[model samples]
Every structure is written in C-alpha cells, then in structure tokens.
Target: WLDFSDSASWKNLDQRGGLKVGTTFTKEISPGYVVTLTVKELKPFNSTEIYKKRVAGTATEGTYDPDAENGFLTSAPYYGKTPPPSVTGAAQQKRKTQLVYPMNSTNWGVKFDIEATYLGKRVAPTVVMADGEDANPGEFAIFTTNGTGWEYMGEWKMAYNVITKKMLDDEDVKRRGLLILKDKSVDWYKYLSPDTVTGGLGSQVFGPNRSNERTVPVVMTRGASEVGFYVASSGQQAMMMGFLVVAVSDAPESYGEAFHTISTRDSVTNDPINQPYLG
Candidate 1:
C-alpha cells in the first residue's frame, strides 16, 4: 500500500498532472492481468460527510495511536484493518470507531492484493500469481452477462516492480519508508467460517491497483478486478491483510526488504484496503 499521509507521492503525481481527478493508465504488475487505473475523481480527506462519517475508513471516531501495540489491530481502528465501503455498506460492520483510530494512513495500503473464494478452499496467493486463469476457474453469475464477466472465477495476481531509492527518499514517505520485499511470511489464511466466505467476490466491489507509475479506479461486476479484495460476511470476519512472497535464501531477500512507501486513497491500491486476497 502506498501511503498518502503526506502528499509527496501525491504531489509528485499532481505536479505532472497524475493527480488530476480524471486520468487513465495501466501497469501489469500481475502478469496477464493488465491493471487499468482511471482516476474517476479525487477528493480531500474529508471531502464529504461520508469520508469522515462513514465512507473512508474503519475507525472513524478517534485519533490515531501510533505508539499502540499491534495487538488486536484486527479490531483496532487503524488504517490497516478497516472495512471498505463494499463490506461496510451492507450494514454488516459492528466495528467500534471511537475506542480506536488508525495511525492515520497505516490502513491505507494493507488491502491492495486481490483474490476470490470458492466452496471451502481460498485461492492461495501463489495460485493467482501462477496463472490460475485455468487452474482455479469458476463462474460469477452475479457479474456475468452473456457469459462475459468472470470475476466469479478470476482474481488479480501479484506482480513485482522495484521500489526505487528515489521513491523511498521522497519527503512524504521517508518518515515511514515502505518495503515490498517478498515478505518472509505473507500470512497464510484459513478459510473464514460459515457464510462469511460467500463463495465468490461477494460484496467485493473494486479492482486491486498496483499503480507503480499510473493510477486508475475500477468497479467490481464480474471481470473488474481491484482491491477491497478480501470480503467476509462480517467486518470482524475479514480483518487485515496478501499476495504471498517467499524469500529464497540468497535469491530474493533484496525484494523482501525495502522502504515502506505511502499508499493511496480508496480509489487506488497503488496499495489500499481490506485483506490481501492471497490464497
């Protein structure tokens, strides 16, 4: 997740016209799955009552506690664990916003990875990364028309791009420099219990953005793949973060460790919401 706490990254884009409300571009971080970003609109942090009231994040009622421990962050009001509008819109969230609040932008980039659910097994991140185009295929009648939309059976996979020193040194993100190393552990998940899994995208509504150079916004019908990826029946059911990256000895450690970068607003994963839908 690219952080947006300060606007250095945002400003970098803005200066070159990348921050304009309506823009379009694509980068294929995830193999054949060409990511398309069309910035539908841009708004200030509190552009609407919805942004502050109920639209933007998980913990809407309190100030961020950066010093707080990482315990129970699943229940904390931090940026990393908040529910997306897709999940929260159905009135399924019982999250407590007042007791906790995100460390401003911590929740920003947590959920950019994408995946889908089927019967009992979750699609491991590796599967998607490895061309599940035919391996784990299914149908999403919910988004299908003339048998076209296949989100019912598709997902966005992880792709790699160098997080350059220039990006890490950018003033806005240097404070919390980001890392995208093939993590030592991309938490392997167990299938969420009962109805929460929902057998497909469920309420998943957006595509995953890896806006390395350009950014775009997308919708979730059948084929549209974006972040806000992991969806569960309840907000608590699906907590935080995936796209697994295994570090091989002397092979990919460099990819596993780098500076943490600022993330995007809800419109882009560039790294943004929900659990990374890794298998």
Candidate 2:
C-alpha cells in the first residue's frame, strides 16, 4: 500500500511531478492482464449548495390561460405544481434561469497509466477509467492496438491542459472546471457512461465555451484511479468534504511496474487509482 500522508517524507517529494520510491506499488505476477488505479480527493474538503435548483412545472402543469366567458383559470405553479423538467434539458437550452447541480460525488483529476507485455506473442490490452456517473458521469476508456504489435505498451488519459488551469482560477456562478490528462489509446471510451440529458447533454454536458483552454464540464464517473480535490479558496473547501483513493491493477506479474502518488496542491499523477488493477 502507498500512503502519501506520511508526515516524515511529505516535505521532500517533488510537487512538480516525478516517480517516487515512497509511494511505489509492491505487486507482480503475469502479463496480458488489465489494471485500474485510483486516487480520491487529493484535497478533501466540504461544500454546500454546490448545486441548487428551483425547477418550473413541466409542459403539462406550467401553463395559465384565462377566458372572460368562463371567468375561470387553472394552471400549475413552477414550484409544487407540475414536476419540474430534468436539469439537463433546461440548462442545456440556456444556462440562465436554471438550477444546475454538481454531481455530488467527489470531483478530482484521476490519472491512468497502463503498460502491458504479452507472453505468447503480440497482443493489445483493453483498459478502462470510470469515475462516477450516478449523478453525472464522464468516463474515459483506452485500448492499446496501435503501439507495439506483439508486446504493446502505451498510456492514455486526459492530461492537465490550459482550460484546467483557468478553472483553478475561475470565478463563475457554478465554479465549474474539468479534469485533464494525456491518453495513448482509444478504447478507453467504452467506460464513458451515458449522458444524463434526455433531450440534450445531461448535467455532464460541456458548454460551448468549454475547451482545453477553458473550463470543461465532464460527467463524473466511479473508479479506483487517483483523485485530487482542487478548491480555489477555503470557502469552497468548506462545502463537500473527505475523499478516497484506491488503485486496482490487472498486471500482477508486472505489479512492480505500476506507480502511485497523492498531493494536496495542484499536481499530476498517472493512473493512481488502485494497485490491484494496476497489477
């Protein structure tokens, strides 16, 4: 098990990002197996009202009409009237005048790094990274087929981009941001969960302004990857609190090949989800 909270060595680790001996994994076995690693809530904190809503009645009850001859009118109120439409449709149409809520689960950047070698001949491996999509999910999958033919090895995951930095410094009503990392394979999309939006992209929908240079709205998924919580201020940290990090690996034969790390600041790691998956 790799522990980052070690009080003695915490001060010496390089915040810039690099392989460390203290947090290295200790498992090894055979080849051709898939691995999953995870790190949760690097900067654990509490937040309230990260998402709030006051929905209007659906098309059925949210209408009001009057007739002089009848001298009577009946319609459902926006609240306590007809059930409100899902947040996805209304929010996607126009962000204004809508109540959009956060995924509620811990939001952090989970880096996934995979390396595989075949014993029989040449073969590719399938890897997955699902963060948590129950409320809103953004899943990234990777498949290694282009790299080494007989014995292949590659890396794929969203790398920290310019947009991620802006989120760190952004100040929006929603205060939205995106997780970033680099990916080397393409099959990783298999783990990407469906969009919650019925008519449009759900709460995980990325706005038009979103880009590698702008804030990104992604569907949070569940996984064993390394997680880091980033809050701009103490006020934000006071909201939702506490997170977990678990790593799972499939390459037990090459278990020693996996890596893990954790931090409280803006840093980076490659697939720190769970050592079991990485093995």
Candidate 3:
C-alpha cells in the first residue's frame, strides 16, 4: 500500500529518494533452500480517511474500514529487504544484471538492479503485496520479452469467491482482477478484500509496462491450500504447489549454468515410469 499522500510524485521522498535492493542469482533450489523475498512499503496514517470514504460509496452502501493497514505511508517490515546505504561520490550502476541458467526449468532466467524515482523523475518499480490471511488458489504474472521468449503480458488468478467471501462481481472477475492491479488509477483495491468491490487485501501489482521496457519477468505461483475459509476442504487438499521467479531483464550468457545443466539431466526418454494405469 503506497500513498505518499496520494502522490505529488510520491510526495517529497528523502535520502536521495529512498529505495535500493541488490541480488545476483544462478542456481540452488534445495541445498540451503535459500529464498527470502520480503519487501513491504506500507503506509497507513489512520487508514487514509477510511480509504477515501470507501472510494466515495455512491450506492455501494458504505461501512468501510476493511482494515488493510488503515493509512500507510511506508509502514515498514524490512521495506525492500535491504541495500539502502548509498551516497559517497554517488556513482552506482549495475543495470544489465542478467542470468539465464539454461539446463532448463523452462529456461530459468533472472534479472535485477532496480532504481526508482517519482518527483525526481525516473520511475518503473511498483511491485506490491499486502498483509495476507488466506483463500488458497493464488498466482501472479507479468512476463514480457522482446528479446525472444517469455510471453503472457499479464495474469492473476484466485478470482475471489472463497465460499462467497465475495469480490468476483464478475465482469470477467473484475477484468482479470483489473489487469492484475495495473489498472483503475491504482489503489488496486488496496490489494483486496475490505469485503471487496474490486477488492484488495493480500494485495498485488507489478504495474509498469512502458512498452515492455527492457528486462521483464515477474512470477508468483502459490497453491498448496490449507489456509481456508473452506476452499474445497479435505484438509485444504493436501497443500503442495509453489513458485517464485522475479527476473526483470538482462540475462543470457550461460543462462544460469545452462539452467543448472538442464535441471539435473537424465529423463530425455526414460520419461515414462508409471501413471497410465487405466484399467
């Protein structure tokens, strides 16, 4: 939830306009199991007038306070993981930050080295997610590649209705959750579920596509179940689906040890061991 008082270009940001993160990746999904991507820039200064009078009701009835942090202005929870300590001579550049890893987890790639500014000009980073609870079937996407591959310019599943907890007033489920939160002058419903009406609770948005500018990839897949408001019961169907990939541009050279040497070799033909037992 970002609202530097609803943007006069992110309203007077300090520390050379605050925001810096760094990373370089190639492989490793298990061994040390390293994966910590926590970046929250909350801003709740008394719930922004109860989220703009529930976006000025006009017949949706009223009763706001869906309570997704109330009125944040960078509420904080290790905001953007880490890296904010720059400013000596001022020169910092790492932009073509690429890695492909070709052995293949569908061409496993990577990219990062981000920089953003609003009142000072340069802008293109706006990824967001909020204080979640759970409904189950989740997935997020924004993949664009002019350098050949990575398609689907948009996606966001978990189309609300978790046993009628609401939000899918269906206009094709609020236009694919309003084009995965890049539409409607973005409050993106605050990331969903203040009982929803184009909701926003476990929030989301990568929301930037200036003609697919450079290194682009943002993937989030989650479906292991068990969080519940019922979502099909049976102990939330035994839970086990997950994924996260955040590549933003320049990768290709030896593409992550050729995608970790084709994801650990072997099955090219030994591909059938069981599963067709149809009697």
Candidate 4:
C-alpha cells in the first residue's frame, strides 16, 4: 500500500503534465496476469465533460451556457426549465438560443504514482476495474492545493464506518475524491470484525501495518468538523475486493449553513445525478 499522495512523480505530473492524461501503465504480474491503470488522463466529471465538448466542436473555450437546452437540462425541472420551441423550422433553427450553465472553473488536479516491485521480478497485481480497455477506477484522495503541499480535504477508505460492516452504495461513492494504494499482496489489513482477515481489495482494511507496507501515514485531522470516506462495493461475493473513495465533510457551520445539511448534495462528493457528462 504505497501512498503516492506526496510522491515526487505525482507532484511533477499534477503541476506539469508529464505523461499524457490517457496514458495507462500495464504491469506483467506473471505470464498471463496483468493490471493496468491510468492517472494522467483521469479527472472529475465536470472537468471531463467540458473538455469533451470542446474537443468535439460543440463548445467554445472559456464559455458556459447555463440554459443550454440539452438532454440533461430537459430531464430535470428543478435544475431549470427547457425553453419552448420556436416556430418555422428554418427560421427557428437560425434564431434558436443556446443556454449554458456557469461551470465551476475552480477545479483541482488528480495524480497517482504506482510503483510496486516484489522480489527482483516485475510483479503485476490486480487493481479494481470493470473490464478490459476501460479506465482503471481505483480509489483516490481529494485535496485542496495550497502552495506546494496538499491539505487533505476528507478521509480515506480505512476510516469509514459503513464500509467496515454493511455493504457500500455506488451512487454515493462517486461524490468525493478517492485514494487507492498498492495491490492486496503487500499491504496490511484490519477487517470490520477486527478478527477476520481478507485477501483482496474492495474489502475495508486498516492502514499500513506490515513490513511490506509502502503507503505513508495518512493523517486525517479536519478539526472538530465531521470528515471521512465511504467505500463503493465491487459487486463480488467470495472475494469482494476493490472499492471506490467518496469524500465527506460536515464542518463548523461558519463556513456555510449548508455545511450542517446531511444530504449528499451538499457533501464534497459528486453524486450520480450531478456527475459531469462523459462526452
């Protein structure tokens, strides 16, 4: 379990994009075993949607349309109402108004540094992923960039109470930032029962507690405010390994009245309903 949160490689990549965003690292564990992941191209939903539109020629740089009558705006009325269609197909098309929402340009970057070497041979371990060619959806931590250091915004997977016993929900899982460490082999784990031990990812475990542990000490001190992470189940049975990170924070209400609100909407995590578009 190596915490790349403060690694030199991740720092350089976060500030300056060294590897292409879509670049994926594939490691050969054995003859036919391999695990692949990408950190360079990974970003939050809102940021990715904007980039996708820009690349596809549908959106302009530095421009946002709040009232854009896209499929999304039409789906939910609470977000906004869809304007009535204009008459005369030809004239209407030319005079049609396009509305765009004000995007929160205040976004942060995510970087992962994975360096796992067992024995003298290169070992490829399993990371939680859905299918082949799809992006590796490992956990990641969220942080507010402050000068050169990262101020931990929320907690990590090991600190959650829900994931420790009852199963985790996927919808709420995507709301926050996540941090996934090394493969299941070399890391230390403490189960919910504090007695039973698991051998895979997804299952909750205590932080680095073994000699082979590589993850650095994760300090989660958000003062008296409520802060932590939630796990998203991998949907497996026997070895229900691999999980997602969802950041949560309920702070000194002084920051805002919404801080005291308990709904997933106000939390830092990105809910399924409000996720940024894929393309």
lDDT of 3 by residue, 1-279 (tens): 222122222222235542223321222223533222221222221124444554564433242333433111122232244332321112221211211111111101122333444544554543432222222222111221223322232333222232112332343253443232322222433333343222322232121111212343444423222222225742323434445445425433443443444433344433235644344
**Best-first order by TM-score:** 1, 3, 4, 2
User: Can you tell me which runs of candidate 1 are displaced by over 4 Å?
Assistant: 1-13, 26-37, 43-150, 155-195, 199-279
lDDT of each: 0.26, 0.25, 0.29, 0.29
What are the per-model C-alpha RMSD values against the true structure? 24.6, 26.9, 21.2, 23.7
Q: Roughly what TM-score does model 1 have, to 2 decimal places?
A: 0.20
| lDDT (10s digit) by residue, model 4, range 1-279 | 222222232222322333335444444445554444455333332243433343344333333332222122222332234332211112112122211122211122333444445554446443321111111223221222112321113322321222222121232265342222222211111211232232122323221111121344434433224554555665432322233235335433365545546454343665667777644
Candidate 3 structure, TM-score to reference: 0.19
Quote model 2's TM-score.
0.19
Candidate 2 deviant stretches above 4 angstroms: 1-107, 120-123, 136-279
RMSD of 1: 24.6
Ranking by lDDT: 4, 3, 1, 2
Candidate 1 lDDT (Cα, 0 to 1): 0.26
Off by over 4 Å in 3: 1-41, 44-46, 53-279
How does model 2 fare in lDDT? 0.25
| Each prediction's TM-score versus the true structure | 0.20, 0.19, 0.19, 0.19
Lowest summed lDDT across 10 adjacent residues in model 2 is found at 44-53
Candidate 2 per-residue lDDT over residues 1-279, each given as its tens digit: 112222232222224332222322111224443222222112100110111111124332211211111100122122233322211112231232222222321211212233334543434544322211122122221112223322212222231221222232343223353221121111112122222222112232221112122344444534325555566973344334344344434423331313333332444455656443545
Clashes of each: 37, 93, 34, 27
Q: Residue 44 lDDT in model 2?
A: 8
Q: For model 4, what is the error of residue 125's alpha carbon versus the real structure, in angstroms, after optimal superposition?
A: 9.7
